Amino acid sequence: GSSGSSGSTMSGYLYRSKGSKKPWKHLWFVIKNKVLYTYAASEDVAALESQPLLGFTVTLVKDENSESKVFQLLHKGMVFYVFKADDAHSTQRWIDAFQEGTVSGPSSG
């Protein structure tokens, strides 16, 4: 329960990695139709890749660079790729953004 609503679920440059000690990758990402699309530039003409968050998972990682500003994209239980967010606040967003992506929301009403 925070932030208004004006734009896509989440969109911002992040750093992809296959784990620690691995080289980061500056790429653009977006969340649409509950799918994690890949990009290169904000003003891109087409997504580099597209991967649905159906069955996937997310979790916070200790990491060395950050303490709680970087997460990992789990898939079936195994880490698919790493992701670093600007600040902690952001991370949480991406996290919940990735968490609420695989799920469909809790039971209400």
Task: Answer whether 41's CB lies under 8 Å from 28's CB.
Answer: yes
Q: Which two tokens stand for residue 49?
A: 């890749």
Question: How far is residue 39's CA from residue 41's CA, in Å, rounded to a whole number?
Answer: 6
Residue with tokens 């997460």: 71
Q: 21: left (phi > 0), else alpha (psi -120 to 50), else beta?
A: left
Phi, psi values for residue 53, rounded to 5°? -95, 35
**Rounded-to-integer distance, Cα 29 and Cα 11, Å:** 6
27 exposed, middle or buried (CB, 10 Å; 0-12, 13-18, 19+)?
middle
How was this structure determined? It was done by NMR
CATH number of the domain to which 86 belongs: 2.30.29.30
Contact 30, 41 (CB under 8 A): no
When divided into structural domains, the chain yields a total of 1
> C-alpha angle 9/27/100, rounded to 5°?
30
Structural domain boundaries, residue 104: 1-109
In one-letter notation, the amino acid at residue 52 is P
Place of tokens 């953004």: 97
